[PDB]
Every structure is written in structure tokens, then in C-alpha cells.
Design a protein around this nucleic acid. Structure first.
Ligand code: MG
Length: 800
RNA sequence: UAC
């Protein structure tokens, strides 16, 4: 029901001086006053409402507001520093915007006690409405100055991404509680928007046209479908605002609509003819389709040449890899650089001279918060082979030189399928590839004995299944099929579909591009996934160097949801199947569109418990549950349902079975940044904090059990420390034990010899759902059937 | 193949 209080403050690890992008706020103790606004029409966008309120305050200045500067949230709530002279009773007013008349009623609703909040920060376990009030106050002005996106703000600076897209720089701002004081979280952000250009040029940039003069013919269906999928849902505006709901198949010269003549009779009329009659405009490009806007019952069609893409539209649809890369190159910068940019941002914002921040007596410190962090000692890693070499993670990174796999799978029989055109990928390529791969393999501890028994060329996904159907039937004990493919191709999905869901064979693909030039590290990293794909163990945590939670049987779960770019959401939960913990088992379900809550969690947890008991012959006395990607506002419901789901999964097994459940939420999408005070502590060109820095003081929840942990070594840009919030804990973990455990689990990721940002279970869950995505593409019964995995595939970490 |  309620998250546990904080048990203790972690004392383990080596102390480090840090600075967090949290800026202390001096909050007065006075009572803010809360008024409610009912504006009609009631479905106006927040910006219009803000303009209405502005003009309202400036208009009724004489009898209502006076010299007071109230702050507005864009919806229905208006706050004032000192009370409005209206009393309890509701007042109605009219506000005219320069041609429209708005009826705005204002009635006093409540009082916001800043003292209650102040005291909550000091042992009176926190009012959300007060924090939200402060938020409104702090972001009243930037909301009117810039383009608000969630808790961020953006503007237009000439930073093309291509695709009709652009880069907008801005910032994130959020009022946040912390022990004792109120913090202002300020970070530099940037996101993708759509350019303010004519739809013609949009078509040009989407279909790679240098000019609209080319393609002097009607569009390929191929093209229409792409442009349709690009512009659908976007707002346009007439050059003489509408919402594009569809794109016509027929050109503007032939696309018709029911036109009512003055006699009353209706006759079908072409868009071109209508624009020639009504607007005296002859379409220059009548061969091009139309944009169906508004209601589909309205039958409203607009030619492309008379529409412009409305400025300020954030790009939500998934970015291409090149666009994403460009975004990275434009946004990524070292930690000191980002810190300086946040400083310039604070200087530019100048909260202390803000009329509204002044009005409410709020004051913001210009210095980042001094926080003392602790670099946790990393776990050693035990490898196998003759040596049984122990590797020590230096800066969250280690290697496999003079090291073999823990239990390297002896590869005797295996096949090679190349879908690469043989001109591009030739016999000698395959030979040098298998040669190099074998040397690196023997050096890795997973010996691929003998040349490949099978090795053939093929093309088209249509031939994937039967080829496999042949292999499994002609080679006894066939362990692995190495599939070679060039560039983007749906054959990967087919190979994964048949391989994981149909026949149950381990498949390891390589890009054709990476076949010809082989680097020892690439091949080694390939073997890392190949070994775990065959059920082997690459490496384990040092047994003696582990938290006491491993004293009695414990299962580690990792859950995540993934949402579609009608298409269902994918829920994925994985569980540890040994005591290392290395090998994991996977469960995956399809569920309601954009439903974050794992609906069928109980069945999955039950299934994982069953597999655990089958693999270890033990009933886990403790269940550790790492939940990914849950907003701070969705906590109570996801906890209420999923905790009861795990509990019910335990009860459905046995009446007496009640293991301790630790419900933890891992957040990676936040704006908490940590910087090194001493330049001697900076690591790499990024200048980031080292791998293992843990912050559970100062900027963390005043009462609850939460902590920041930066388990990964920043390679590029500024590191984002993973936040962990303990929603439940029957096991009564200490801060040190839980933080160390969470840190050590980040070293159990098998796809790389380095510490990752989030623990292996959550990452694995993400991989499972991401694989289910490819399992889908190729009614609920059929989907759940297509996502289900072959039983022989099930034991093994196929998602690796 | 591995933010
Ligand atoms: Mg997720």
C-alpha cells in the first residue's frame, strides 16, 4: 500500500564530492490562495487559456486583481500570493480576445499552506498539491515565453535532421522535494520537431525530391503510403488550422466531394474544380493527392499546395537511425560542457528577477547542490577455463585476455546460412571468418571444433523456414545456425520467428558488412552471445564477494513494458534460474494498447517460479522485482496491482508459500545530473562520474527509500545515473546491501564485459519485448500464439 | 557484434 520509510543511509564505498543540477529554493511560509477557472468553450488549448487569463488580469485590473500577479496552469487552476477581493462567491466575467468572446468564471476553492509542505520536509510523512502549486508558479512565465512540452520548454533557433524534421533546443524544469529543502531541477534538453514548411516541400524532403517539378506524374502507391504515414496526425494550415486525418488515393483533379447547389440538389464535385470556382485558384499540381482533414464525415479535402505544416509540432513518430545519430551528435557533449550550459541556462533564466517568482517570495540559489556521493567497490568476475581467471572491473570495464568462459559450450556441429549475395560475400570470406572466429573462440573458452558441416547461400525470407526445416532434419544435434545478411531486411525477423517460435534452434546472425573485415573484439563480443545462446555461462560474480541475500534461495525478476511506435503493447518479465545469477528465463505477453500495467503478471511470475523450482530444485525465499519505466505519478496503481499479482502468484502455488517481495522501480528517463567537483575524479573524455557513484542523500526523497546509482562508465555525452525507488520491501534491506546488490547485478550482463546502466534482469526484459516485436510482424489468440516460444528455446537466453 |  505505502512505500516503506528509508531504513538507513548507505555508508559503504569511497566518498566523492559531487554537484547535482538541483537548485535550492527559499520558500516563504505564507499561504497561497487557490481559485478555480471555468472557461467556455472548455476544450481550448492551454496556450489560448493562458492568453485569456493574461488579458483577463490586465482587463479587470481595477475591480478584481489589482497589482497582484497571479500564476496560471493553463487549465482550470489560478493561484495568487495574496487573496483576491472576491470572497467565497463565484464571479463571472467576459474577456474579448483580439474577435472572440470568452465567459470566464472564477471562484475561490482552497488554501495552499506552504508551512505544511515545509514541515513535511521535516518528519511529517508530502502534500502533492503544494508542490504542484509551486510548479505552476515557477513555470508560469516560461509557459508563455516558450513552447511547453510536458515538463520542458523549447524554441526555434537551421538544425536539419532530414525527413521534414528539425532539432529544437530547450530545457527541463521541475519542482522537486528533497530532505529539508525544496529543489529546482534544471537540465538542458533537445528534441525533434517538424519544420514550418509548405506541404509540397515536406513531400520533397520525405520522398527525397530535389524539387516538386520532378515526379510530374501521380505518386506511386509506394510513395503515397509513405507520405501518408509521415503526415498523418499532423496539423496543417491554409495559406488563404486543420488536423490531417488521411491522404487521398485519387489526385486533386479527380478526387470528388458532395457539393450542395443553391437548388438543394447535391452533385459530386472535384477538388480542383471547387478551388477554381470558389477561390479563383487553379491548382499547379492537380496530379498530387489531397489531405483529408477534420472529421471523415465532413469530407474535407485540401490540395497540398495550399497547406503549410503548423510550427511547434513535436515529432513523436520514431526517428530513423541517421536522424537519431544526427540528434546524438547535436545533443551529446561532455559533462563539464553540459554543466556549463546549465549554468548559462540559470544565468539566462534569472529566476530571482522573475516578477511571478518575486510575487510569491520564492528565491532560487544560483549554485548547484553540493552532494556527497559514494563510489561502490565493483564485484570481481569469475571466469572458467583451465585458469578460472578473475577479472577486476576497472572503470566499469574489463576484458577477456587470458580468460576463458565459465562453462564454455563445446561446439562440434553447426551450420552457416548466408543471405548475402555471393558476389558480395564469397567462399573465402566464409573461410577467413570461420578461421578467425575459431581462433578467437578457442581463446574465449568456447571451442568451435571442426569446420562448419553446412554452409550455403540463399535469398528471400521465404526460404528461411524450409532451409531450417532441412537442417534440423539432416544434422543430428545441430547446435547453431550462423545467418549472414546484408543491411536492413525482414529476413531477420523470419529467422528469429522460425528459430525461436517454430523449430527452436539457436540462431546467431552477423551483418554481411562485418563478415569481410573481422576485428578480434567484434568476434569475441559475438561469441559472448553465442555461448549464452547455447546455454553456457560466460562468467559469474565472485561467490565470496556477494551480499548476504544469497544466503538463502532468491529469484531476481526483471519486468518491462515496451509500447508500439491498434498495435498491442508488449509486457516482458524475466527471472533468474540459478544462484550465480547468470542464466535467465523469459516470459512475454501482448496486451492493451499503451497499457503500462502488466495485466497478466501473476501467470508470468508463477511460470518463472515453476521454472526456478525445476532448474534449482529450490523454492525462492525472496523475490527481488526490478520494474522498468514507470512514471512517478503511476506508482500507486502499478504497485497496487503488480504487488498483489506477485503475491497471488505465490499463493496460487501453495497456501503456505509467502516469500519476501522487494518491489523496486528503476528509472533511466529523468533529468538528474551529477558532476565531479574535483577534476581529478573525472573519467574519460566525457569527464563523467566514475562507475559506482551512489547518491542517497540530499536530493533524494525526504522519507522514502530511493537512491541514484551510476553503474555504467560514461563513454559519450553526460551520464544519466539510474534512479531506484523501493516501493516495497518485506526483506528489510539496508541501503548498503541493496545498493551494492543492484550495482553487482549490473555486472551480470553477458552481451558485454562492462557494467551496464540498469541491472541485467530489466535489460533482459527489454530485450525480450524487443524480440517479441520481431516475432509479431509476419486475433488475440493468434498474437499470443505468435509471441509464444518453442519449449526448447525457452530454457536458453535466446533474447541475448 | 557490443550509449
Ligand atoms: Mg519499458
Amino acid at each position: 500500500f505505502k512505500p516503506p520509510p528509508r531504513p538507513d543511509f548507505g555508508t559503504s564505498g569511497r566518498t566523492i564530492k559531487l554537484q547535482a543540477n538541483f537548485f535550492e529554493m527559499d520558500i516563504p511560509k505564507i499561504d497561497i490562495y487557490h481559485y478555480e477557472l471555468d472557461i467556455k468553450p472548455e476544450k481550448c488549448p492551454r496556450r489560448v487559456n493562458r492568453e485569456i487569463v493574461e488579458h483577463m488580469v490586465q482587463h479587470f485590473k481595477t475591480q478584481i486583481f489589482g497589482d497582484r500577479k497571479p500564476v496560471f496552469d493553463g487549465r482550470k487552476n489560478l493561484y495568487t500570493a495574496m487573496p483576491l477581493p472576491i470572497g467565497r462567491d463565484k464571479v463571472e466575467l467576459e474577456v474579448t480576445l483580439p474577435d472572440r468572446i470568452f465567459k470566464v468564471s472564477i471562484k475561490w476553492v482552497s488554501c495552499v499552506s506552504l508551512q505544511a509542505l515545509h514541515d513535511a520536509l521535516s518528519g511529517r510523512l508530502v502534500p502533492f498539491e503544494t508542490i504542484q502549486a509551486l510548479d505552476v508558479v515557477m513555470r508560469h512565465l516560461p509557459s508563455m515565453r516558450y513552447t511547453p512540452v510536458g515538463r520542458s520548454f523549447f524554441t526555434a533557433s537551421s538544425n536539419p535532421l532530414g525527413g521534414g524534421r528539425e532539432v529544437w533546443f530547450g530545457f527541463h524544469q521541475s519542482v522537486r522535494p528533497s530532505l529539508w529543502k525544496m529543489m529546482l531541477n534544471i537540465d538542458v534538453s533537445a528534441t525533434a520537431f517538424y519544420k514550418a514548411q509548405p506541404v509540397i516541400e515536406f513531400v520533397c524532403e520525405v520522398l527525397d525530391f530535389k524539387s516538386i517539378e520532378e515526379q510530374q506524374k501521380p505518386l506511386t502507391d509506394s510513395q503515397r503510403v509513405k507520405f501518408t504515414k509521415e503526415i498523418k496526425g499532423l496539423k496543417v494550415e491554409i495559406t488563404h488550422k486543420y488536423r490531417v486525418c488521411n491522404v487521398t488515393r485519387r489526385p486533386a483533379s479527380h478526387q470528388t466531394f458532395p457539393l450542395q447547389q443553391e437548388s438543394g440538389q447535391t452533385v459530386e464535385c472535384t477538388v480542383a474544380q471547387y478551388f477554381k470556382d470558389r477561390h479563383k485558384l487553379v491548382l499547379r499540381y492537380p496530379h498530387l493527392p489531397c489531405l483529408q482533414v477534420g472529421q471523415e464525415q465532413k469530407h474535407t479535402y485540401l490540395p497540398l499546395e495550399v497547406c503549410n505544416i503548423v510550427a511547434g509540432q513535436r515529432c513523436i513518430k520514431k526517428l530513423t537511425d541517421n536522424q537519431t545519430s544526427t540528434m546524438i551528435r547535436a545533443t551529446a557533449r561532455s559533462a563539464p560542457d553540459r554543466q556549463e550550459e546549465i549554468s548559462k541556462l540559470m544565468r539566462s533564466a534569472d529566476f530571482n528577477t522573475d516578477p511571478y517568482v518575486r510575487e510569491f517570495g520564492i528565491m532560487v540559489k544560483d549554485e548547484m547542490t553540493d552532494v556527497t556521493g559514494r563510489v561502490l567497490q565493483p564485484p570481481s568476475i569469475l571466469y572458467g577455463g583451465r585458469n578460472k581467471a578473475i577479472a577486476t572491473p576497472v572503470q566499469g570495464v574489463w576484458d577477456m585476455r587470458n580468460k576463458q568462459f565459465h562453462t564454455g559450450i563445446e561446439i562440434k556441429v553447426w551450420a552457416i546460412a548466408c543471405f548475402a549475395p555471393q558476389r558480395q560475400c564469397t567462399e573465402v570470406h566464409l573461410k577467413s571468418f570461420t578461421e578467425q572466429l575459431r581462433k578467437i573462440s578457442r581463446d574465449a573458452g568456447m571451442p568451435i571444433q571442426g569446420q562448419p558441416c553446412f554452409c550455403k547461400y540463399a535469398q528471400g525470407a521465404d526460404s528461411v523456414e524450409p532451409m531450417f526445416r532441412h537442417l534440423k532434419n539432416t544434422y543430428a544435434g545441430l547446435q547453431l545456425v550462423v545467418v549472414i545478411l546484408p543491411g536492413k531486411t525482414p529476413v531477420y525477423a523470419e529467422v528469429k520467428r522460425v528459430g525461436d517460435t517454430v523449430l527452436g534452434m539457436a540462431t546467431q546472425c552477423v551483418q554481411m558488412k562485418n563478415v569481410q573485415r573481422t576485428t578480434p573484439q567484434t568476434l569475441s563480443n559475438l561469441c559472448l552471445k553465442i555461448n549464452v545462446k547455447l546455454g553456457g555461462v560466460n562468467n559469474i560474480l565472485l561467490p565470496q564477494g556477494r551480499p548476504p541475500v544469497f544466503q538463502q534461495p532468491v529469484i531476481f525478476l526483471g519486468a518491462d513494458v515496451t509500447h508500439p511506435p491498434k498495435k498491442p503493447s508488449i509486457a516482458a518479465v524475466v527471472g533468474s534460474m540459478d544462484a550465480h545469477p547468470n542464466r535467465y528465463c523469459a516470459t512475454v505477453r501482448v496486451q492493451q494498447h499503451r497499457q503500462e500495467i502488466i495485466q497478466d503478471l501473476a501467470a508470468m511470475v508463477r511460470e518463472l517460479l515453476i521454472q526456478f523450482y525445476k532448474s534449482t530444485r529450490f523454492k525462492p525465499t525472496r523475490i527481488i522485482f526490478y520494474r522498468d519505466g514507470v512514471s512517478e505519478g503511476q506508482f500507486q496503481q502499478v504497485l497496487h496491482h503488480e504487488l498483489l499479482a506477485i503475491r497471488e502468484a505465490c499463493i496460487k502455488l501453495e497456501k503456505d508459500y509467502q516469500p519476501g517481495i522487494t518491489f523496486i522501480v528503476v528509472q533511466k528517463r529523468h533529468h538528474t545530473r551529477l558532476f565531479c567537483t574535483d577534476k581529478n575524479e573525472r573519467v574519460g573524455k566525457s569527464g563523467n562520474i566514475p562507475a559506482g557513484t551512489t547518491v542517497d542523500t540530499k536530493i533524494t526523497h525526504p522519507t522514502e527509500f530511493d537512491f541514484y546509482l551510476c553503474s555504467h562508465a560514461g563513454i559519450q555525452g553526460t551520464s544519466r545515473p539510474s534512479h531506484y525507488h523501493v516501493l516495497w520491501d518485506d526483506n528489510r534491506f539496508s541501503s548498503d546491501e541493496l545498493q551494492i546488490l543492484t550495482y553487482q547485478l549490473c555486472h551480470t550482463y553477458v552481451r558485454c564485459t562492462r557494467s551496464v546502466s540498469i541491472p541485467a534482469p530489466a535489460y533482459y526484459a527489454h530485450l525480450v519485448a524487443f524480440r517479441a516485436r520481431y516475432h509479431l510482424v509476419d486475433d488475440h489468440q493468434a498474437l499470443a500464439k505468435a509471441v509464444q516460444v518453442h519449449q526448447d528455446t525457452l530454457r536458453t537466453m535466446y533474447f541475448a
